[PDB]
Symmetry: D2
Subunit: 206 residues, 4 copies
């Protein structure tokens, strides 16, 4: 059974970049919905697995096929938002401060500068044509190199792709404050990105 994670900051601590009203809805309603949906999906899979074991029919296999979509969607919603809150922080907790150490070295070597990486990520965010996410990732399969990837809906990065910074591009992440002005949101959010957490994720490779 999963639950909402503890936040490291108060709902209004990311103002003026992200409003307290958005954070409260985003956490208490949206993230909670994924929590509930994931727990439900996993319970349903347990029931269907037990059913399939005693009656291993195509009919019962078809029922299991039907709920894996919910496990993927709600599981992704649960995990993506957990990553998101952990890579946000108010300026008083280091939000917006550049990364140091090995991550900073890799960023300059690969993208030239942090600003160039941020600009690339904002282009990737703008290019999400629907609901989705951008992630700055470390790829463990190609020698640990940085990349920026897009996902749709609540799809996430798995396997050798370790998420370092997750940025939510669903309209509920910004609409109450920015309405249609999504580039203003993508620009603003970097002021409260926690690069210390990004560096930790980079160093651990988890």
């Amino acid at each position: 059974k999963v639950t909402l994670p503890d936040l490291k900051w108060d709902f209004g601590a990311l103002e003026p970049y992200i409003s307290g009203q958005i954070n409260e809805l985003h956490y208490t309603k949206h993230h909670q919905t994924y929590v509930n949906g994931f727990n439900t999906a996993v319970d349903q899979f347990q029931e269907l697995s037990d059913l399939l074991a005693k009656e291993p029919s195509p009919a019962n296999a078809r029922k299991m096929i039907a709920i894996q979509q919910n496990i993927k969607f709600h599981g992704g919603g649960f995990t993506n938002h957990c990553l998101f809150w952990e890579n946000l922080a108010p300026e008083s907790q280091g939000g917006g401060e550049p990364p140091t150490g090995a991550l900073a070295k890799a960023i300059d070597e690969q993208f030239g500068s942090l600003d160039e990486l941020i600009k690339l990520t904002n282009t990737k965010l703008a290019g999400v044509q629907g609901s989705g996410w951008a992630f700055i990732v470390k790829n463990l399969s190609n020698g640990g190199k940085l990349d920026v990837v897009q996902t749709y809906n609540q799809d996430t990065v798995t396997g050798p792709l370790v998420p370092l910074v997750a940025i939510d591009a669903w309209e509920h992440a910004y609409y109450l404050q920015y309405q249609n002005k999504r580039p203003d949101y993508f620009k603003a959010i970097w002021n409260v990105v926690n690069w210390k957490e990004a560096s930790r994720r980079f160093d651990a490779g988890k």
Copy 2:
């Protein structure tokens, strides 16, 4: 734990429309792979579920997300092939004979004739751009009306879309015999379609 279903006919019973060599590989290799993959994926889900209950971390949920794809793909492969074998039959067992009862009525009313429904299905099959399936379905949500739908890979028809006839359009379903000539396969298969099973599925409104 799932297993290969019993066949209602021998591998060579659908000759010359579908070769015995294809049926043998299709069943003993391809369908078996989905059986194994599905069993493995469900066991893996179980293992991860037990772990999540003790450590409900985002990291463990992430692992479960990865396994979902395999449950979907192999579960689909298992289910779709089971449907496929059950809607094929040699002529001696009624393969190629038209449906009767309520299904026959519905077909003429919606498509004009069985031949027109078959033509539409062959167009849908030709339109699969990659691996996939076409299904003649009964839609329980719109008053039980017939339709033809396409799926990709091992996606299948679920919920209110009840499969009546499943036709495999993966290249392994025909390539050894027809090579690139996929429309020849799509034309040929109707000679061994089991419309009695289709009628049964239509009446039952379920698998």
Copy 3:
């Protein structure tokens, strides 16, 4: 060059069901974005098509492939919103009034009642996991039968699936008024659905 369509109603005319604030942003900003993106994509097509004629290389075909997604997405956004505005009307212009003629007959025959069709549509809307649309359609391939289809992003219904009622499920269609309470929006919108236009589309069997 495509442009924003004329609206048949004032921005605030669908209140209380959809706020004037939402309609104004939805039309002047969101729909405009798709108009701009589609015009840009088509111009880019033309440039690349000309280039390909002179230099029919894989590299140039690769550039053409890259632009296809923008044509699809923005084309869909343009088309879907045009459909949407035309199937909404204030109560004073008949919004919420049931369809008549051949469409009303089809609805009762397939769904039992208009209420049952609306409930199905709301379930399909609720099932959109991300941004998307639901469409009540007439399927020209199966004898003209009604159905409800979901799409994601700005995917749309093409070919034999003729849209009769389009309902937008993107968060921008409701969030300023309803926030997370998407089912309340899906319930409310029917009060301003223009079933006369749905009937017109049903009879025409085209856009």
Copy 4:
């Protein structure tokens, strides 16, 4: 108008790794189908484009949406196969010989060895659940770093992802020789991969 490209080798030249029977069908039938489909789709879109200029209706935009699917699929089929023939070669033309220069240095730095990159690519190929491709790519957006990406159907790599080696995982690429033994085909194909072409693509970007 696109056409089938010239091959640099005879149909049977890749035996015993890929049969002449397969190459002949794969080129003269399958690739030709994509050539024809792409030409048809581009012509259709041009007609619709000229029409939209005079009648910029939702009805006409809807027709254009329908055609783009064929542009993507057949365009991908056309380009992916062009890449494929150019990154295959018989042993007599250097097939199977390791890359050199900058590409070889990048491979060792990122993957440890060519063998390790090949093993990774084979895992990516094995993971294609349906028809599709694996590509070894140079990513121009992250400093030119190598990666391996999977695509489905005739989807391809575009923009900053430069294809260096394309490997076809559609069943028609192997079934006549390997039938269900897809992993054996993935293992075998490296004996006729043209890494000289891969190195050229890497250096050019």
